[PDB]
Design an enzyme around this catalytic site. Structure first.
Site, PDB file in Angstrom:
ATOM      1  N   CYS A   1       0.821  -1.253   0.000  1.00 52.81           N
ATOM      2  CA  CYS A   1       0.000   0.000   0.000  1.00 52.81           C
ATOM      3  C   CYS A   1       0.818   1.247   0.000  1.00 52.81           C
ATOM      4  CB  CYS A   1      -0.997   0.099   1.192  1.00 52.81           C
ATOM      5  SG  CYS A   1      -2.064   1.549   1.314  1.00 52.81           S
TER       6      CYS A   1
ATOM      7  N   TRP B   1      -9.329   6.427  -0.723  1.00 52.89           N
ATOM      8  CA  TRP B   1      -9.612   7.094  -2.017  1.00 52.89           C
ATOM      9  C   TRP B   1      -8.673   6.660  -3.114  1.00 52.89           C
ATOM     10  CZ3 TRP B   1      -8.353   9.967   2.438  1.00 52.89           C
ATOM     11  CH2 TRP B   1      -7.042  10.433   2.509  1.00 52.89           C
TER      12      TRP B   1
HETATM   13  C1  HEM Z   1      -6.474   6.558   1.608  1.00 52.26           C
HETATM   14  C2  HEM Z   1      -6.165   6.337   0.348  1.00 52.26           C
HETATM   15  C3  HEM Z   1      -5.503   5.122  -0.126  1.00 52.26           C
HETATM   16  C4  HEM Z   1      -4.750   5.096  -1.345  1.00 52.26           C
HETATM   17  C5  HEM Z   1      -4.522   6.128  -2.448  1.00 52.26           C
HETATM   18  C6  HEM Z   1      -4.241   3.715  -1.234  1.00 52.26           C
HETATM   19  C7  HEM Z   1      -3.565   3.267  -2.401  1.00 52.26           C
HETATM   20  C8  HEM Z   1      -3.356   1.891  -2.716  1.00 52.26           C
HETATM   21  C9  HEM Z   1      -2.968   1.394  -4.040  1.00 52.26           C
HETATM   22  C10 HEM Z   1      -2.688   2.176  -5.273  1.00 52.26           C
HETATM   23  C11 HEM Z   1      -2.757  -0.042  -3.839  1.00 52.26           C
HETATM   24  C12 HEM Z   1      -2.372  -1.075  -4.878  1.00 52.26           C
HETATM   25  C13 HEM Z   1      -3.745  -1.316  -5.457  1.00 52.26           C
HETATM   26  C14 HEM Z   1      -3.754  -2.154  -6.688  1.00 52.26           C
HETATM   27  O1  HEM Z   1      -2.954  -1.840  -7.602  1.00 52.26           O
HETATM   28  O2  HEM Z   1      -4.573  -3.103  -6.746  1.00 52.26           O
HETATM   29  C15 HEM Z   1      -3.126  -0.336  -2.465  1.00 52.26           C
HETATM   30  C16 HEM Z   1      -3.049  -1.681  -1.890  1.00 52.26           C
HETATM   31  C17 HEM Z   1      -3.480  -2.004  -0.541  1.00 52.26           C
HETATM   32  N1  HEM Z   1      -3.973  -1.075   0.322  1.00 52.26           N
HETATM   33 FE1  HEM Z   1      -4.014   0.986   0.176  1.00 52.26          FE
HETATM   34  N2  HEM Z   1      -4.622   2.910  -0.244  1.00 52.26           N
HETATM   35  C18 HEM Z   1      -5.329   3.775   0.491  1.00 52.26           C
HETATM   36  C19 HEM Z   1      -6.022   3.404   1.732  1.00 52.26           C
HETATM   37  C20 HEM Z   1      -6.016   2.099   2.316  1.00 52.26           C
HETATM   38  C21 HEM Z   1      -6.837   1.748   3.497  1.00 52.26           C
HETATM   39  C22 HEM Z   1      -7.755   2.638   4.314  1.00 52.26           C
HETATM   40  C23 HEM Z   1      -6.487   0.339   3.689  1.00 52.26           C
HETATM   41  C24 HEM Z   1      -6.897  -0.554   4.791  1.00 52.26           C
HETATM   42  C25 HEM Z   1      -7.530  -0.115   5.837  1.00 52.26           C
HETATM   43  C26 HEM Z   1      -5.512  -0.063   2.655  1.00 52.26           C
HETATM   44  C27 HEM Z   1      -4.879  -1.381   2.556  1.00 52.26           C
HETATM   45  C28 HEM Z   1      -4.181  -1.820   1.389  1.00 52.26           C
HETATM   46  C29 HEM Z   1      -4.045  -3.275   1.250  1.00 52.26           C
HETATM   47  C30 HEM Z   1      -4.329  -4.354   2.300  1.00 52.26           C
HETATM   48  C31 HEM Z   1      -3.514  -3.404  -0.108  1.00 52.26           C
HETATM   49  C32 HEM Z   1      -3.036  -4.657  -0.824  1.00 52.26           C
HETATM   50  C33 HEM Z   1      -4.133  -5.461  -1.435  1.00 52.26           C
HETATM   51  C34 HEM Z   1      -3.608  -6.679  -2.113  1.00 52.26           C
HETATM   52  O3  HEM Z   1      -2.570  -7.173  -1.654  1.00 52.26           O
HETATM   53  O4  HEM Z   1      -4.285  -7.173  -3.070  1.00 52.26           O
HETATM   54  N3  HEM Z   1      -5.342   0.983   1.662  1.00 52.26           N
HETATM   55  N4  HEM Z   1      -3.565   0.828  -1.759  1.00 52.26           N
HETATM   56  N1  LIG Z   2      -7.254   3.516  -3.440  1.00 51.03           N
HETATM   57  C1  LIG Z   2      -7.201   2.325  -2.789  1.00 51.03           C
HETATM   58  C2  LIG Z   2      -7.357   2.272  -1.404  1.00 51.03           C
HETATM   59  C3  LIG Z   2      -7.298   1.053  -0.741  1.00 51.03           C
HETATM   60  C4  LIG Z   2      -7.065  -0.111  -1.469  1.00 51.03           C
HETATM   61  C5  LIG Z   2      -7.008  -1.358  -0.860  1.00 51.03           C
HETATM   62  C6  LIG Z   2      -6.788  -2.531  -1.592  1.00 51.03           C
HETATM   63  C7  LIG Z   2      -6.647  -2.460  -2.979  1.00 51.03           C
HETATM   64  C8  LIG Z   2      -6.427  -3.660  -3.862  1.00 51.03           C
HETATM   65  C9  LIG Z   2      -7.604  -4.583  -3.976  1.00 51.03           C
HETATM   66  N2  LIG Z   2      -7.318  -5.705  -4.843  1.00 51.03           N
HETATM   67  C10 LIG Z   2      -7.721  -7.033  -4.397  1.00 51.03           C
HETATM   68  C11 LIG Z   2      -7.398  -8.133  -5.403  1.00 51.03           C
HETATM   69  C12 LIG Z   2      -5.970  -8.137  -5.941  1.00 51.03           C
HETATM   70  C13 LIG Z   2      -5.805  -9.452  -6.687  1.00 51.03           C
HETATM   71  C14 LIG Z   2      -5.056 -10.513  -6.159  1.00 51.03           C
HETATM   72  C15 LIG Z   2      -4.929 -11.714  -6.845  1.00 51.03           C
HETATM   73  C16 LIG Z   2      -5.562 -11.849  -8.075  1.00 51.03           C
HETATM   74  C17 LIG Z   2      -6.323 -10.794  -8.606  1.00 51.03           C
HETATM   75  F1  LIG Z   2      -6.943 -10.926  -9.804  1.00 51.03           F
HETATM   76  C18 LIG Z   2      -6.439  -9.595  -7.911  1.00 51.03           C
HETATM   77  C19 LIG Z   2      -6.732  -1.214  -3.583  1.00 51.03           C
HETATM   78  C20 LIG Z   2      -6.938  -0.036  -2.848  1.00 51.03           C
HETATM   79  N3  LIG Z   2      -7.002   1.181  -3.477  1.00 51.03           N
END
Ligand code: HEM
Ligand SMILES: Nc1ccc2ccc(CCNCCCc3cccc(F)c3)cc2n1
Ligand code: HEM
Ligand SMILES: Nc1ccc2ccc(CCNCCCc3cccc(F)c3)cc2n1
Ligand SMILES: C[C@H](O)[C@H](O)[C@H]1CNc2nc(N)[nH]c(=O)c2N1
Ligand SMILES: C[C@H](O)[C@H](O)[C@H]1CNc2nc(N)[nH]c(=O)c2N1
Ligand SMILES: [Zn+2]
Lengths: 407, 411
Positions: B108, B280
């Site tokens: 993240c 967001w």
């Molecule tokens: C506040 C604005 C936020 C922004 C701009 C942000 C941005 C991002 C982005 C760009 C990714 C990669 C997403 C992707 O390419 O699929 C990501 C992954 C992640 N974010 Fe954040 N995030 C934010 C808030 C949060 C919040 C509030 C949580 C949890 C409470 C969080 C937990 C994570 C987790 C667990 C992943 C990894 C998901 C995965 O492994 O598939 N995010 N976030």
């Molecule tokens: N802007 C944000 C904020 C919080 C977020 C928190 C989490 C995420 C990523 C959510 N993606 C879940 C699935 C990722 C995945 C994993 C394995 C296979 C697949 F197709 C997709 C994006 C966020 N973007």
């Protein structure tokens, strides 16, 4: 044990078993992944020689033949007595090709088996090395129809007698700090540019001054030599639609030729082994021109395009970046100098992975280096899982020689 | 053991000691790196250690380590485990927990914000209707008329694994996908399967390109129930471009609230299988991936056509050109309607400052480079040049299997 890799765009799944033959270590553990760190005796040598010879004879379908067992004995005898040994030409060629084949950071490996190997193991002086290098440059340039090649100088013996090319690539542009405090030319070579001046080079002090070669034979002090300009193929950089682009005054060299790596075959160490192929456009246009610590021209270009540089959210850096890269490719293609774009290179590499999975049982690949430095997710390598591991023969980094050398 | 990471653009070197507190495993070994692999019920036995480590961390964070209140809480949790087999978190430990899971989320980029997280405790919830109510409140609070606020809602924890709370949707708001008989797809291809489950459970599909899906909600291990999110609660943004007036005629929109609903939250060995959270959008999530992935809306060709780029050779970089324009449009649209969005330059720069601060105050910041680097223009963002160490701390968010592969149907 048998590992799967999935492409998330096509659902193609490949099974990897080649990793079980891995020998060298990665930097990672079960507790920590180091995937994004740039750099993480007689008794020692026979196992190494054996492992290499066993793969060689299997590759020519003579595993367990008189010829195989005879060579194993012959090298075993030669080590026991001399403490090193010599590769047969055929083994040398195979080793070099396989070092490229196993290079997990290289997107260009579909070509691994068309590599011209020049055996410079009879070389003894820096003037010799110079002659071999000019022949390599001219052969590889082929008047813009570029061909891959490696030139292999003599292998380390006792580390008191190393052959080294001090240059990081055979052709690079100079860099000079100024009292100003800014930088003229290429800031990556500032220190090497000083060593050349400090050795005797008369720097023209321009933006795109081809550096001199600094060659070290037999652990002696190294010597300067100018590559004949007529052998250095260069491309002036213009844009197919922006007339003013030509006036930025940019050029690049056609031949990417890395010269500071160490080639390891069957335990033997080849410390001077310059090799060359041809450029993917992004290496020049994204990295060389646009890195903050490189020529860093994005600011200047975005101005000429009159984009809104007030806010990052106009994506003015991004817009300028694309145009610079369209220009690099256009210029090379117009001048008929081989170049590949990132779309076509990455697509090739997906096909290369396919081929190697079925023919060899895998393909080591480092995702962090394979995915291009622009437009990652619109290239198919972005969606492709890759396993990274170290096989031998290989190319390796080695310390810059001026920290080691004894004067 | 101290471990250095170097930023190759600035020469800033940082020292990681935090990796020493890492227990869980990476997928990697000394012989293979699995850094690009997308995905590499407990007894009393394995629970009190997990509880104890969690509470030693919580009690250190509040500067009460080894206090009488720390020891009494340990003793109290211990008794509750061996008597009831599980235990309940205090409100404060739950808030700390949820925040640290975010803070520890190595993939993240938006973690600078970790400590500003609104935690809604839904552990008194018992039915799917109660879940719907909780999720509605989350969505209105988080949305805040375009001035988005980070939040998470936490439903009851796992007990025997037979009474799980789950949100079947992968995000709270997401568009339908419909596979046509001719093999084409209408709407988002990513959600076809899930769209098919909803249909069968009785959703009457409008069958357009941007139909907001219903919530499918499982409480207490029961069969899931369909609910419609009130439309007045679903904030959306029509996409136009500041210079190309034909862009609006492509018919594109997107929703403003990104809210991941299918992850599992782990805190002191407890497992919260329904913990929807929201922040967001970074612009590229929509502009690069949601619109331009080949397996998603895949509008690159149509956008390049309208720009009359040279599409006969990839070396024109017509794909790269179209992509930047689409991303400009996404950002202009959100900003014009005053809906919070952050571009990739701004987000990656923020992250590098977060990461540095975290090395100073925390002794580390685990980070996954494959995910932190944006999917366009990688090397002109500062993260590209940043060496990162990836390891797993708890509390943590984890994947879990999709509930339709595991659920025992009651009927
Ligand atoms: C506040 C604005 C936020 C922004 C701009 C942000 C941005 C991002 C982005 C760009 C990714 C990669 C997403 C992707 O390419 O699929 C990501 C992954 C992640 N974010 Fe954040 N995030 C934010 C808030 C949060 C919040 C509030 C949580 C949890 C409470 C969080 C937990 C994570 C987790 C667990 C992943 C990894 C998901 C995965 O492994 O598939 N995010 N976030
Ligand atoms: N802007 C944000 C904020 C919080 C977020 C928190 C989490 C995420 C990523 C959510 N993606 C879940 C699935 C990722 C995945 C994993 C394995 C296979 C697949 F197709 C997709 C994006 C966020 N973007
Ligand atoms: C034929 C055209 C070739 C193309 C288009 C090509 C492409 C690339 C690219 C884009 C990189 C990443 C470079 C960087 O970002 O610094 C790379 C790395 C590498 N390539 Fe290739 N390559 C080619 C030929 C070769 C040949 C002929 C060899 C060896 C015989 C080779 C060995 C390597 C090695 C060892 C690395 C990584 C070295 C390191 O880790 O720093 N390449 N190549
Ligand atoms: N087009 C090609 C062909 C062959 C190539 C073969 C090798 C290379 C990469 C050479 N890079 C070495 C420098 C990378 C590095 C690593 C660690 C620290 C550092 F400062 C720089 C690029 C190539 N490009
Ligand atoms: C920190 C990170 O490892 C570093 O910037 C890498 C990332 N990926 C790379 N990829 C390629 N192809 N070339 C590089 O120099 C780098 N640099
Ligand atoms: C195979 C590869 O790991 C996979 O495509 C990853 C690459 N990096 C990513 N990075 C982010 N932020 N989001 C993603 O979905 C992915 N996908
Ligand atoms: Zn790893």
């Amino acid at each position: 044990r048998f590992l799967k890799v999935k492409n998330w765009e096509t659902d193609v799944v490949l099974t990897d078993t080649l990793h079980l033959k891995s020998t060298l270590e990665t930097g990672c553990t079960e507790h920590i992944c180091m995937g994004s760190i740039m750099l993480p005796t007689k008794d020692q040598l026979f196992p190494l020689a054996k492992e290499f010879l066993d793969q060689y004879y299997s590759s020519i379908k003579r595993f367990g033949s008189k010829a195989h067992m005879d060579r194993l004995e012959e090298v075993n005898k030669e080590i026991e007595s001399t403490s090193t040994y010599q590769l047969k030409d055929t083994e040398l060629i195979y080793g070099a090709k396989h070092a490229w084949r196993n290079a997990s950071r290289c997107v260009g490996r579909i070509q691994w088996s068309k590599l011209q190997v020049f055996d410079a193991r009879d070389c003894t002086t820096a003037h010799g090395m110079f002659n071999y290098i000019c022949n390599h440059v001219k052969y590889a340039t082929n008047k813009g129809n570029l061909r891959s090649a490696i030139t292999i100088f003599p292998q380390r013996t006792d580390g008191k007698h190393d052959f080294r090319v001090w240059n990081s690539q055979l052709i690079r542009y100079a860099g000079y700090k100024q009292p100003d405090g800014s930088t003229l030319g290429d800031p990556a070579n500032v220190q090497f540019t000083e060593i050349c001046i400090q050795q005797g080079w008369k720097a023209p002090r321009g933006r795109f001054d081809v550096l001199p070669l600094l060659l070290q034979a037999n652990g002696n002090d190294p010597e300067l030599f100018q590559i004949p300009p007529e052998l250095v193929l260069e491309v002036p950089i213009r844009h197919p639609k922006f007339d003013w682009f030509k006036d930025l005054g940019l050029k690049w060299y056609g031949l990417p030729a890395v010269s500071n790596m160490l080639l390891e075959i069957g335990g033997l160490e080849f410390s001077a082994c310059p090799f060359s192929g041809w450029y993917m456009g992004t290496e020049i246009g994204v990295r060389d021109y646009c890195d903050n610590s490189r020529y860093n021209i994005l600011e200047e270009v975005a101005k000429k395009m009159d984009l809104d540089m007030r806010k990052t959210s106009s994506l003015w850096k991004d817009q300028a970046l694309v145009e610079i890269n369209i220009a690099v490719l256009y210029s090379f293609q117009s001048d008929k100098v081989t170049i590949v774009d990132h779309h076509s290179a990455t697509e090739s590499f997906i096909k290369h992975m396919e081929n190697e999975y079925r023919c060899r049982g895998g393909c080591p690949a480092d995702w962090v280096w394979i995915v291009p430095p622009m437009s990652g997710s619109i290239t198919p390598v972005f969606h492709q899982e890759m396993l990274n591991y170290r096989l031998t023969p290989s190319f390796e980094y080695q310390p810059d020689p001026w920290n080691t050398h004894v004067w």
